[PDB]
Amino acid sequence: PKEPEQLRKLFIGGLSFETTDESLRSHFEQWGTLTDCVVMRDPNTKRSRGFGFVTYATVEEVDAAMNARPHKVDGRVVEPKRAVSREHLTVKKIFVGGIKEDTEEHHLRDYFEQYGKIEVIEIMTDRGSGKKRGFAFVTFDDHDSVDKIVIQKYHTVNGHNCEVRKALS
Ligand SMILES: Cc1nn(C)cc1C(=O)NCC1CCC1
């Protein structure tokens, strides 16, 4: 079963107005098979609107393209992003809930470091008693880690099934 198409799209902002469907394709085919590749244009002038999207055959190919940032396409550094949810923002921090009183920093680090480079791990404690409250925040150096994390259906850390959400600052 193919992964859902929505999870195989990369939305590319910041394009050069000279980038075409064809030149965007030739660039991003370096990291996988593309089933779709679109530059958005004005319906009347045909002038570029400066953004588009590509669709890879697999999620691993999306990962390969994101791991190859920064992407300079037709002379300009562009901004690729995975699909955002409706309401959500592009952030570098997550809330991790349901970790209870026995989960330590190294449990969170060993798991989440495989999504991206961690900068801060904050295990929350009670302001009055100092006891652990059962949730934590993890900050990464880049938003794609968070984008990969929050689209997973399940997160298991230290045996616990955790609730993970984007955290706004
Ligand atoms: C979801 C989503 N997440 N991001 C970052 C962009 C989208 C999106 O739906 N873009 C609209 C299409 C691009 C051609 C029209």
Side-chain angles (χ1 to χ4, degrees):
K2 260 175 127 24
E3 309 99 292
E5 185 178 320
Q6 186 79 356
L7 309 177
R8 302 182 272 108
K9 292 180 171 202
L10 274 179
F11 298 93
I12 320 298
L15 297 179
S16 164
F17 291 6
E18 305 305 313
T19 295
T20 62
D21 296 353
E22 301 82 14
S23 75
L24 191 61
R25 187 176 269 283
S26 289
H27 184 84
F28 279 101
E29 273 177 340
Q30 289 176 79
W31 294 282
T33 302
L34 290 180
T35 59
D36 212 353
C37 181
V38 174
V39 167
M40 293 298 274
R41 292 186 181 277
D42 191 80
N44 299 311
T45 66
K46 303 182 191 293
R47 189 182 308 286
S48 180
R49 290 150 70 180
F51 72 99
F53 71 93
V54 303
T55 299
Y56 283 100
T58 75
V59 168
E60 285 195 347
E61 288 169 337
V62 178
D63 288 351
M66 294 310 276
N67 294 341
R69 291 171 300 146
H71 287 283
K72 177 174 100 73
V73 181
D74 300 318
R76 186 173 278 266
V77 176
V78 301
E79 183 187 2
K81 295 165 46 153
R82 299 181 204 248
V84 296
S85 295
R86 297 286 293 173
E87 184 65 12
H88 259 257
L89 191 50
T90 301
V91 299
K92 305 194 260 164
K93 192 165 119 167
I94 55 174
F95 162 95
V96 187
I99 57 182
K100 295 196 196 208
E101 291 235 7
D102 67 339
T103 296
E104 316 191 44
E105 172 149 347
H106 70 87
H107 290 123
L108 292 172
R109 172 177 307 280
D110 290 347
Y111 181 70
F112 285 114
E113 73 191 354
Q114 298 189 256
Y115 278 102
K117 192 25 167 143
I118 297 173
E119 289 187 344
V120 181
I121 297 170
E122 189 187 356
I123 303 192
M124 299 309 273
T125 58
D126 186 273
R127 180 170 301 278
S129 70
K131 295 166 145 63
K132 284 159 186 242
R133 293 180 68 199
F135 67 102
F137 299 93
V138 182
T139 307
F140 299 86
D141 80 353
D142 168 77
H143 69 91
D144 194 51
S145 54
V146 173
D147 298 340
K148 287 185 292 185
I149 288 163
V150 298
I151 64 198
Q152 299 283 96
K153 280 193 66 162
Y154 310 102
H155 287 290
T156 302
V157 184
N158 190 35
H160 290 108
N161 285 149
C162 303
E163 179 194 329
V164 185
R165 288 181 257 136
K166 300 190 157 177
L168 285 38
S169 334

